[PDB]
Design a protein around this nucleic acid. Structure first.
Ligand SMILES: [Mg+2]
Ligand SMILES: [Mg+2]
Ligand SMILES: [Mg+2]
Length: 596
DNA sequence: GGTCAGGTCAGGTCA
């Protein structure tokens, strides 16, 4: 019933010094070297693969091919995605049992389970602990990517910023024995850091916190009418404005930290008693007024703004910023466009000076991140026509909007897709359910909306390029899923690949059609259902080509058998873009190699 | 049977 092994470190166990009667004594040799390895200073850089080869005797696998099979799991662990799993069957299936010396005495039909439990034993008591001993996993928050850093380096970085947080009196030792609400975590974010609190589980009170969060959001509904859909605001303003659009995006820095609690507390108290009674009012007030945080076996008062990671901080910060909005942006030219997400403001106007004035307005009220500022003002140092905002790329000159893709160079795209679900597991004999759950539409649903498929302000050329780019992503997910089928399902029958493959292509083109015609626009000429199918299949073509020999059968099959049109009813579309791979996805890395 | 509204779950988006 349980077919999965989680790759994550927290699964690890603490090794006994001696193995029990149900395990073969060879394990104790391994454990010995483990202990001795821990006593190594290991000041210089270390490769975990290497140390394991000097911890687990080759005599345990016997043959190099057996050893390589096991280390291929170790490699997956060292390069793991959050939530990633393998099939427990991987740990015993396809091994050369003749070459394993300590298994010759036992009858053949009992060897796989034995090998499984011994390989499980090494993974839980030696492999994961050794990775944990020298490294800390931090989640980059780009997809499910996990970066490992040396414990010596993270602790120094965590100590440096801890002192900074003490000298600036953001963190102040309380020394009153007050109960901490959670543990402070310092996480690395580029050159900076993020101080957040991980809240101790509060089973009997988070129902209460959902109630207070709900009531705050009710307050934000009643006062301050809705901001507009971002799509409707960009639609109307583009229709309104016939001249060259001018715009700016500014990034407010540390919005949670720059909230003035005294001002926030007065907003809380001013809520009408029918909305929020005085007891609840006062509970929120001493909640944000007494933030207590546990660092290294010491309790501190967080004294700078709102605590990130706390459940109330989001709605409470939104309430503060909503109040700041009218204090300073209630009166702006109504022929202008403005939108705010949480700490990001996007403002556009046909007049440059009003965009210029907006930058000064915002800078006078808030501390911003100047490197994160993007603007088409001609005078500015580094002007651009493309403004990234809220997951989209807005071209102020063309008015076209494209999806924004966060794929740094050398990012491993398999981190974008969570293909394993521990709560609902798929057996190693059932590969098809795995692949089709992978191709559930919901995962790309956010790039199949009116914003990318409208023709109101969007050209057919960019609506196509949007659909292609999304499909490129679905291909990359298909690809990652295939490697999962190869490396842990160990499938040999790839015949079942086609049905859902093209079965997904159909529905995706179909899913696009209904959106596109639901949001017909003035630039809409004519788009053929079949053209979307030709685009989807050409998207897969461009991706599947990265590992041609593995898929050369597949590429040839649909390359010939299936039909590529690109005769869409528009002449502007280069159609050249569809044949190749967009530069964004040329530079992403689909192979797995350990580096720690 | 065919809807609805509500509920769960899921992999995704925004800061
Ligand atoms: Mg929640
Ligand atoms: Mg920011
Ligand atoms: Mg929010």
């Amino acid at each position: 019933m349980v077919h999965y092994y989680r790759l994550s470190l927290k699964s690890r166990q603490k090794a006994p010094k001696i193995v029990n009667s149900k395990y073969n004594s060879i394990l104790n040799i391994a454990l010995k070297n483990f202990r001795l390895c821990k006593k190594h200073k290991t000041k210089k850089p270390v490769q975990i693969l290497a140390l394991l080869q000097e911890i687990i005797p080759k005599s345990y696998f016997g043959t190099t091919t057996n050893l390589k099979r096991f280390y291929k799991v170790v490699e997956k662990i060292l390069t793991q995605s959050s939530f990633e799993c393998i099939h427990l069957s991987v740990l015993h299936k396809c091994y050369d049992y003749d070459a394993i010396p300590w298994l010759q005495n036992v009858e053949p039909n009992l060897r796989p389970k034995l090998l499984l439990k011994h390989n499980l034993f090494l993974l839980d008591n030696i492999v994961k602990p050794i990775i944990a001993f020298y490294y800390k996993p931090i989640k980059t928050l780009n997809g499910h990517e996990i970066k490992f850093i040396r414990k010596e380096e993270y602790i120094s970085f965590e100590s440096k910023v801890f002192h900074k947080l003490k000298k600036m009196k953001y963190l102040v030792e309380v020394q009153d024995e007050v109960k901490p609400r959670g543990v402070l975590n310092i996480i690395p974010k580029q050159d900076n850091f993020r101080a957040i609190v991980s809240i101790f589980p509060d089973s009997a009170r988070k129902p209460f916190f959902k109630l207070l969060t709900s009531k705050i959001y009710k307050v934000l509904e009643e006062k301050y009418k809705t901001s507009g859909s971002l799509y409707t605001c960009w639609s109307e303003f583009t229709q309104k404005t016939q001249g060259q659009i001018y715009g700016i995006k500014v990034d407010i820095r540390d919005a949670y930290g720059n909230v003035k609690i005294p001002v926030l507390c007065k907003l809380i108290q001013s809520i009408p008693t029918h909305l929020l009674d005085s007891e609840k009012k006062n509970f929120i007030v001493d909640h944000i007024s007494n933030q207590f945080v546990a660092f290294r076996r010491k309790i501190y008062k967080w004294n700078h703004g709102l605590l990130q990671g706390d459940p109330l901080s989001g709605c409470l910060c939104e309430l503060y910023m909503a109040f700041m909005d009218r204090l300073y942006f209630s009166n702006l030219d109504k022929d202008a466009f403005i939108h705010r997400t949480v700490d990001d403001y996007f403002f556009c106007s046909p007049h440059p000076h009003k965009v210029y004035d907006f930058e000064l307005l915002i800078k006078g009220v808030y501390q911003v991140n100047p490197t994160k500022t993007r603007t088409n003002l001609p005078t500015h140092r580094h002007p651009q026509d493309e403004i990234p905002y809220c997951g989209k790329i807005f071209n102020l000159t063309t008015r076209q909007v494209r999806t924004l893709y966060k794929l740094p160079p050398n990012y491993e795209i398999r981190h974008k897709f969570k293909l394993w679900n521990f709560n609902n597991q798929i057996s190693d004999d059932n590969p098809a359910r795995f692949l089709q759950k992978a191709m559930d539409f919901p995962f790309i649903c956010n790039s199949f909306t009116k914003f990318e498929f409208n023709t109101v302000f969007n050209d057919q050329r960019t609506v196509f390029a949007n659909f292609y780019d999304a499909m490129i992503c679905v291909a990359y997910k298909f690809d990652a899923a295939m490697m999962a089928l190869r490396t842990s399902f160990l499938v040999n029958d790839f015949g079942f690949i086609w049905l859902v493959l093209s079965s997904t292509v159909r529905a995706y083109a179909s899913r696009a059609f209904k959106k596109i015609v639901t949001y017909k626009g003035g630039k809409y000429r004519k788009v053929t259902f079949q053209c979307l199918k030709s685009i989807a299949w050409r998207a897969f073509l461009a991706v599947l080509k990265r590992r041609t020999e593995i898929y050369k059968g597949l590429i040839d099959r649909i390359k010939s058998r299936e039909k590529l049109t690109m005769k869409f009813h528009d002449g502007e579309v280069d159609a050249s873009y569809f044949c190749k791979l967009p530069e964004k996805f040329r530079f992403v890395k689909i192979n797995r190699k350990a580096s720690i």
